[PDB]
Amino acid sequence: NLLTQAIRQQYYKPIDVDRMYGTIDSPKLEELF
Amino acid sequence: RKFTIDDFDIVRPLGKGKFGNVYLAREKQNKFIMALKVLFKSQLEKEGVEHQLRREIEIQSHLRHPNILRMYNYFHDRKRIYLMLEFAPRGELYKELQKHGRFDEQRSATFMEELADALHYCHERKVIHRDIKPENLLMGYKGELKIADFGWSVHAPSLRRRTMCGTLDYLPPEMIEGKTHDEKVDLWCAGVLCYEFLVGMPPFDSPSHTETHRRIVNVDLKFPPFLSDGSKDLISKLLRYHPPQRLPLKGVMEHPWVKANSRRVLPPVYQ
Numbered sequence: 001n002l003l004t005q006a007i008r009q010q011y012y013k014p015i016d017v018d019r020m021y022g023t024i025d026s027p028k029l030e031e032l033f
Numbered sequence: 034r035k036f037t038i039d040d041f042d043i044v045r046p047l048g049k050g051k052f053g054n055v056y057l058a059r060e061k062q063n064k065f066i067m068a069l070k071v072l073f074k075s076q077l078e079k080e081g082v083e084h085q086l087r088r089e090i091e092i093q094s095h096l097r098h099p100n101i102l103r104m105y106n107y108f109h110d111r112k113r114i115y116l117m118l119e120f121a122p123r124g125e126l127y128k129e130l131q132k133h134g135r136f137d138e139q140r141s142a143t144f145m146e147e148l149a150d151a152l153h154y155c156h157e158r159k160v161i162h163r164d165i166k167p168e169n170l171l172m173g174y175k176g177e178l179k180i181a182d183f184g185w186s187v188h189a190p191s192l193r194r195r196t197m198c199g200t201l202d203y204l205p206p207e208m209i210e211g212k213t214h215d216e217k218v219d220l221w222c223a224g225v226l227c228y229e230f231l232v233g234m235p236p237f238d239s240p241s242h243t244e245t246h247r248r249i250v251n252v253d254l255k256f257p258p259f260l261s262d263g264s265k266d267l268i269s270k271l272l273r274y275h276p277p278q279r280l281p282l283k284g285v286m287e288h289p290w291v292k293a294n295s296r297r298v299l300p301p302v303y304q
């Protein structure tokens with residue numbers, strides 16, 4: 001479908017994951033358990 | 034603000050993972066497809082894998098390499114812990130090996146160059162993987178190896194290690210013998226892996242754990258006739274009884290058989 005085609009565009013057009021995700025806060029490890 | 038499950042559209046399940054199901058999902062704001070591993074807080078605690086999952090997350094979340102499955106972030110709710118992970122479109126490497134029986138030299142060498150590069154990145158950070166085997170590897174859009182599980186991994190800044198861990202056919206002699214071990218256990222496992230890629234079975238395969246232990250500690254390596262001299266040279270240089278004598282990871286990447294056969298391609302990077 002346009003998922004296979006969506007997966008292909010992700011490979012060729014990488015996003016700035018380090019910024020788009022590596023910047024967002026995350027729960028502390030203590031909180032998790 | 035951090036992430037919540039409402040930030041994603043769950044497309045479909047991808048299968049069972051370690052202590053949790055994995056689902057293909059798309060993060061809404063970016064319409065970015067990723068895998069979501071879902072763990073139940075109560076199952077974890079009741080299975081005593083709390084101080085185990087933390088280490089796996091603690092290590093995997095800080096590794097950024099094309100051949101290491103990326104953990105983008107993670108979040109939790111009342112009952113679940115969600116890991117936002119890189120989606121590896123081609124799935125399980127072990128399934129591909131099982132389907133083909135054995136890989137040809139090109140495929141094996143490419144995987145070996147990728148593996149060595151990723152393990153070198155880990156070692157430069159004092160991370161020892163300790164459980165390299167086909168089942169812990171996934172494959173990217175273009176078939177690139179992705180180390181995807183870090184269950185036995187350890188950040189070992191100084192002191193040697195004593196824990197026996199890993200998988201039977203992949204254990205280095207030093208673990209079987211109860212000695213301390215260091216990052217060189219990954220060099221041994223890489224040699225077992227190259228052999229299994231090319232042959233379809235690990236080198237010390239035996240009916241009992243005692244006979245396999247025996248074959249490993251005597252490095253009872255018997256090369257099938259169809260292997261090239263180059264692949265045997267590389268395997269023989271990794272599967273050395275003495276850890277100090279094993280070929281370094283940089284050596285695997287520069288080995289002639291790897292250079293002559295690898296068709297490794299680096300994924301496009303952002304910019």
Ligand SMILES: CCS(=O)(=O)Nc1ccc2c(c1)C(/C(=N/c1ccc(CN3CCCCC3)cc1)c1ccccc1)C(=O)N2
Pocket residue numbers: 047048049050051055068070102118119120121122123124125128169170171181182
């Ligand atoms: C190895 C870490 S784990 O927690 O055990 N599982 C894991 C971790 C992170 C993931 C994944 C799993 C996948 C993941 N990807 C995957 C990708 C594609 C498929 C569908 N087919 C499978 C046959 C080959 C073509 C693709 C199945 C799975 C997956 C989920 C569950 C079991 C095996 C493989 C992924 O893309 N990211």
